[PDB]
């Protein structure tokens, strides 16, 4: 967070189009992060359910 | 070319004799198998070039 955001901000602050593409890339990264957290909660639920089912089978 | 033509004639004669036997036989025809038409093809019949000398 300290490196990527600072680097892109300071590099593309001068150019308006560069800052716009930086903003759209940041939006893409945020969407990827949200998808990753959805996958994380899905993974946790799957792990819990599968462990419970394995215990029931055992 | 002449030797190849003669060998072709010999093989065709043997295979034609096989075809005549298969078409005239009905007891084998009772078995609904196409295999018998290809089993003893014109390569494994009794007259063999590599057994000609013996």
């Amino acid at each position: 967070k300290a490196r990527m955001l600072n680097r892109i901000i300071r590099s593309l602050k001068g150019g308006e189009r560069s800052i716009a593409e930086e903003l759209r890339a940041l939006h893409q990264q945020r969407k990827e992060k949200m998808t990753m957290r959805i996958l994380g909660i899905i993974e946790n639920d799957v792990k819990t359910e599968m462990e419970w089912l394995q215990n029931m089978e055992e | 070319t002449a030797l190849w033509d003669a060998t072709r004639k010999i093989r065709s004669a043997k295979e034609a004799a096989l075809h005549r036997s298969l078409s005239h036989n009905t007891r084998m025809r009772a078995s609904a198998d196409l295999k018998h038409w290809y089993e003893e093809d014109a390569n494994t019949l009794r007259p063999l070039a590599f057994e000609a000398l013996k």
Partner: protein, 393 residues
């Protein structure tokens, strides 16, 4: 340059990698045990770009290929020792390099590598995402057996003996018969027409697809053929290194012959076991292990077949109410069911054409056209039509 380096490595009497546990180099079992370049491609996704063997028959083909080429490698090694003597007598680096490149050109070592011939963008991507032709030229450790098969007569025996072919035929017949009787049991249960009924009831919810106003244009766009319509496949995540290596290893592990597998296993264990053996004792242990493995495999196959088809009596042999007391369950396999279906098919059948007295039965094309065919003229006509693509008469 790469060809000269490969020829020098082939000349050398040492391992090109020095026995080092190098990445993306696989000690293939089919290719003897010499290392081969097997990079883990990520364009396809964590996939090792190396052939995956399927059959112990392919394993034996490779082994007998090495046996056949054993003559070539001996004379080739004699030539290699002559060339090494010439190199030792040589003292100039330029002369050594020129001799190496000339020998490489003569031995066709640069033909050992195989380049991906592709023009389609996706096919080009699947190979040039990672290791391109430059990487193929660089990591191109050659093999003496590869050079031998570059110029050698092609073997025809395939190395499978009479016993191996007998076992292969027996297991092929067993698998085919078991699959056929399983399918007949499924049909007798009637789940096939249940599938047809499910398709019929699924057709209610369907709707007419959109073939497009220009149907040819729409079909081409779906195929991705027109200009600019190419869509790259999704970038699948690569697997773990352990899984990627494990699939490739198991490919050959499940294709190894029983004798070789047990011999390798016992020789590996002999160092660690508390009672090591040497010579005749090891041979006896190998023979006993092989016999036990064979009989256990036979027992396991018979037991799994019996379990799947419900073979054997259901409990006590001598019951008060008769020795035959079967309890049929819905949609379950049973020996009585199999016997009944076989009886219905061929109760008093003397020939397959027993009921062919009537033309309607005789001309049926369910089983095949073998009975319908009766002369070589018709057979040749049918095969010609099939080869030309037109419908068989």
């Amino acid at each position: 340059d790469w060809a000269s380096h490969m020829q020098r490595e082939l000349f050398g009497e040492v391992d090109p990698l020095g026995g080092q546990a190098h990445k993306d180099y696989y000690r293939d079992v089919t290719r003897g045990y010499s290392p081969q370049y097997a990079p883990r491609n990520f364009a396809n996704g964590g996939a090792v770009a190396y052939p995956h063997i399927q059959s112990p028959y392919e394993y034996e083909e490779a082994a007998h290929r090495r046996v056949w080429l054993d003559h070539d490698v001996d004379r080739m090694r004699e030539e290699f020792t002559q060339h090494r003597a010439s190199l030792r007598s040589l003292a100039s680096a330029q002369e050594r390099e020129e001799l190496l490149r000339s020998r490489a050109a003569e031995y066709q070592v640069a033909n050992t590598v195989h380049e991906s011939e592709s023009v389609h963008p996706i096919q080009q991507l699947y190979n040039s995402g990672g290791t391109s032709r430059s990487a193929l030229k660089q990591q191109a450790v050659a093999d003496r057996y590869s050079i031998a098969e570059q110029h050698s007569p092609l073997p025809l025996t395939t190395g499978v003996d009479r016993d191996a072919l007998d076992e292969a035929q027996r297991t092929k017949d067993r698998i085919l018969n078991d699959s056929f009787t399983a399918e007949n049991l499924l049909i007798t249960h009637g789940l096939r027409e249940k599938e047809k009924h499910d398709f019929t009831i699924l057709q209610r919810t369907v709707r007419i697809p959109f073939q497009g106003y220009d149907m040819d244009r729409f079909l081409a766009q779906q195929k991705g053929t027109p200009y600019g319509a190419q869509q790259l496949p999704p970038n699948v995540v690569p697997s773990s290194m352990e899984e990627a290596q494990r699939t490739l290893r198991g490919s050959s592990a499940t294709a190894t012959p029983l004798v070789d597998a047990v011999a390798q296993k016992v020789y590996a264990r002999n160092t660690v076991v508390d009672r090591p053996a040497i010579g005749e004792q090891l041979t006896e242990q190998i023979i006993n292990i092989m016999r036990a493995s064979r009989t256990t495999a036979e027992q396991q196959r018979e037991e799994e077949r019996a379990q799947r088809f419900g073979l054997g009596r259901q409990g006590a042999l001598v019951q008060d109410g008769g020795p035959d007391q079967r309890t049929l369950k819905k949609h379950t396999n049973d020996e009585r069911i199999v016997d009944a279906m076989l009886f219905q098919q061929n109760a008093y059948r003397k020939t397959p054409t027993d009921e062919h007295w009537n033309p309607y039965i005789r001309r049926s094309t369910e089983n095949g056209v073998g009975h319908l065919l009766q002369n070589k003229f018709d057979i040749m006509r049918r095969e010609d039509r099939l080869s030309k693509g037109e419908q068989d008469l």
